[PDB]
Amino acid sequence: YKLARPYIADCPNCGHSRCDSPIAIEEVRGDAHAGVIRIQTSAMFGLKTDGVDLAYMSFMNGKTQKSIKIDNLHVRTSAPCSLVSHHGYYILAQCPPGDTVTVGFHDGPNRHTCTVAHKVEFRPVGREKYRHPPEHGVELPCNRYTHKRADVPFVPVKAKCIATLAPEPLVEHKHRTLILHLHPDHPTLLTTRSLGSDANPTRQWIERPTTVNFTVTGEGLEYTWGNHPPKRVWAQES
Amino acid sequence: YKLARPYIADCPNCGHSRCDSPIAIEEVRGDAHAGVIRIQTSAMFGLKTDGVDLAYMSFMNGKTQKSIKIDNLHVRTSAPCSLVSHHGYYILAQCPPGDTVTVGFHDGPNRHTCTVAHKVEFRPVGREKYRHPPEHGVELPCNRYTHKRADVPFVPVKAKCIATLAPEPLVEHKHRTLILHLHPDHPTLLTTRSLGSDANPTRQWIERPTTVNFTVTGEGLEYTWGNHPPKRVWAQES
Amino acid sequence: YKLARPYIADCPNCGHSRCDSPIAIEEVRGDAHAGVIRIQTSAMFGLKTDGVDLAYMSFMNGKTQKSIKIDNLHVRTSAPCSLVSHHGYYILAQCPPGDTVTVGFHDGPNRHTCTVAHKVEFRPVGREKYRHPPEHGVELPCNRYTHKRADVPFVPVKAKCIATLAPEPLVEHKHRTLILHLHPDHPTLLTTRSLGSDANPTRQWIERPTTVNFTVTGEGLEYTWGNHPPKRVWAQES
Amino acid sequence: KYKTKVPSPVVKCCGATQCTSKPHPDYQCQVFTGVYPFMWGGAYCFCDT
Known part of the structure; x- marks a missing residue:
């Protein structure tokens, strides 16, 4: 379950020259296409004086061990960031960047605060960004840590989060020609290729409303626009 | 109303695992050319039990109506916001980025914060940017709101908003030619056009000591620099 | 000495409907060629009944007061910034710009935060900025401040500054040619010129592994990489 | 780097003061009316003009 303890650990940046802080983020997991973070602190979250809550923590800041x-x-x-669940040494929170976390005390005497700039990142596994939910397009996998205890570490599990599919994908088919009328709001990768014995291998990053024409010979083409796995048209104006 | 107490409202999203909140924002004004935003919402600042004040608020915490x-x-x-005035039903704050508006309680066991999406922009009325008037630089037209309680309601008006000034613009007169040694410390939009039947139709944003020579047909030129009141000459000595 | 008291000062934007506020920083000194700041604040940081402390402050107002x-x-x-020493009216801290400090209290009658960002521009005497001299890389003479406690102001101290450099300055020798295979971990300013009649006055900032070839006289060449005083090689295979 | 010295401005709540020159290297004064905008304060000067 929880096999964690609240204690001080060294943090190289604090509110005073007093750097005998807890709340020092040992590890962070942010390898997701979500916005949520599993934080491992030296201070114990999910234990207050009374034990397990979802919105209280306990700490020793070398000047007061309290919750x-x-x-x-x-x-x-x-700006503030609100935790969701506690699993001993580990915190799980919503705090959008999730690689820069600053945990700090407006408690009682002295101001200990740790900030972490952890090596973990949110990234796409595709060719175009979807590392954090936008409002554009439709969902693709992400990782969102369990919001109940399930071993001290909160286990990482797959979940669904919003993903980029490029804004306004107006396709227009015509004779021997596929014009793709594009009207992004943001840098979208347009990749095309023929699916037949025709060629058209065209990668381009585009921004702003543009058109991109491709040959069609009556033997299909795929265009993926803004990170998609193959979308395909065949044996006509494709 | 101003004296009417806050109440629960649809917004089933908060950063914690409690999300039964007030806030839905009835109306918002923030399409100003200032930096300040007037919010009309339940979770009212400028209202305690005494009615309308300037430095107390009242809120439903999720289920606790209190001040x-x-x-x-x-x-x-x-971004964080430090309020400027509180007027009952209306909040007035300096909020530099705008857009989304977030009213939140960062209390313990129940930590509710609602954010409502809105298009709150701060833009030029001329060509000089506004997004947070400071207290240093030339006052220029803007939209704003009254900043003291009238207990009448806070509604849009136009007031004066500070925008940055720049160092001395060293003008050098010559014959049919006016070179302008300009020395911005900050982005100034330099627009010129002649005040003759010729022209100098040159908009550019400039920073740092540069020279810009312009034609004069014998009727000088207007140059507006930083969108600060125009520096204009009408001579052929220019 | 330590005769400083808490008092108000004019702020551009602070809490309440008047910015004649507490915690308002009157003046800031960035008169270093390091990255350290001596701060003059109306409200006093760094003193409780102890004299010089690291963790108490006081302030007053009329509308939002207390210590x-x-x-x-x-x-x-x-992000946090750590004070080191207090000399009454003067605060001394390591903070990155050394001109912009935002102090705010999230307790009491309102939530006031003053920001100071008025100029006293500086950069190190080298060409790389620091927030305080780091361990990594070459030392450079510079100005800074006194950081030991001794209480009046923390006057400038001629004392070391340090500029980080990148990991591998792989020099590759050839006949009258030096290609510098450089492998940045962080943005390094590479300035070169050949030593001798030939010279290659080329400043460039680089990031990520690149090569840069320069001609060489056969009398040597200088490359400073990551802000140094000349690192130079002489007649050989240079 | 210069240090700006402000001795403190002479403010008359519901009055006025004209500039008196003082010998400093970049001494500058300006007489400024208003001080506090109308309806913007909670124990501000009555006169906002």
């Missing part, structure tokens, strides 16, 4: 409400302890990147 | 002094309970847009 | 231990009051640029 507080996540109010006095606010996560931030600058 | 507090503003502590760890923060307004934000896409 | 606290530094905890609910966080200094930020957007």
Whole structure:
């Protein structure tokens, strides 16, 4: 279950020259196409004085071992960030960048705050960004950590999050010609290739409303626009 | 109303695992040429039990109608916001990025924050940017709101908004030619056109000491620099 | 000495409907060629009954007053900044720009935060900026401040500065040619010129592994990589 | 780097003061009316003009 303890650990940046802080983020997992973070702190979350809550933590800042409400302890990147669940050494929170986490105390005497710039990143496994949910397109896999305890580590599990598919994918088929009328809001990768014995291998990154014409010989073509796996038309105007 | 108490409202998304919140934002004004935003919403600042004040708020916490002094309970847009005036039903704050408007309680066991999507932009009325008037630089037209309680309602008006000034614009007169040694410390839009029947139709944003020579047909030229009041000559000495 | 008191000062935007606020930084000194800042704040940081402390402050207003231990009051640029010493009216901290400090308290009658960002521009005497001299790489003489406690102001101290350089400056010798295979971990300024009659005055900032060939006289060449005083090789296979 | 010295501006709530020159290297004054915009304060000067 929870085999964690609240304690101080060294953090190279604190609010004073007093750097005897807890809340020092040992590890972070952010390898997802989500926005959520599993944080491993030296301070124990999911134990207050009374034990298990979803919105209280406990700490020893070398000047007071106590617990507080996540109010006095606010996560931030600058603006507040709200935790969701606690699993001992591990915190699970929503805090959109999820690679820059600053945990800091508005508790009682002295201001200990740790900030972490962990090596983990959110990234696409595709050719175009979908590393964080946009409002564009339709979903693709992400990782969102369990919001109940399931071993001290919160296990990473697959989940569904929004993904980029390029804005306004107006296709227009015509004779021997496939014009793709594009009207992105943001840098979208347009890749095309023929599916027949025709060629057209065209990668291009585009921004702003543009057109991109391709040959068709009556033997299909695929165009993926803004990170998709093959979308295909065949044996005509394709 | 201003004296009417906050109430639960649809917004089933918060950063914690409690999401039964107020806030839905009835109306918002923030399509100003200032930096300030007037919000009309339930989770009212400028209202305690005494009615309309300038430094107290009231809120439903998710289920607790109460008032507090503003502590760890923060307004934000896409960045923290420090309020400027509170007027009952209306909040007035300086919120530099705008767009989304987030009213949130960063309390302990129940930590609700609602954000509502809106298009709140701060833009030029001329060609000089506004997004947070400071107290240094020339005052220029903008939209704004009244900043003291009238208990009448806060509604749009136009007021004056500070925008950055730039160093001395060293003019050098010559015959039928006016070279302008300009020395911005900050982005100034330099627009010129002649005040003759010739022209100098040159918009450019400039930064740092440069020279720009312009024609004069014997009727000088107008140059607006930074969108600060025009520096104009009408001579053939120019 | 340590005769400083808490008082108000004019801020551009601070809490309440008047910005004649607490925690408002009157002046800032960036008169270093390091990255360190001596701060003059109306409200006093760094003193409780102890004299010089690291973790208490005081402030007053008329509308949003009290003094606290530094905890609910966080200094930020957007991340922590650590003070080192207090000399009454003067605060001394390591903070990255050394001109922009945002102090705010998230407790009391309102939530006030003042930001100071008024100029006192500086950069190191080299060509790379620091927030305080790091361990990594070459030292350079510079100005900074006193950082030991001794209480009046923390006057400039001629003392070392350090510029980071990148990991591998792989020089490759050939006949009258030096290609510099460089492998940045971080943006390095590479300035070169050949030594001798031939010279190659080429400043460039590079990031990510690249090669850059320069002609060589046969009398040597200088390359400084990552801000150094000349690193030079002489007649050989240079 | 210069350091700006402000001795403190002479403010008259519901009055006015004309500039008196003082010998400093870039001494500059300006007489500024208003100070506080109308309806913008909670214990501000009555006169906002």
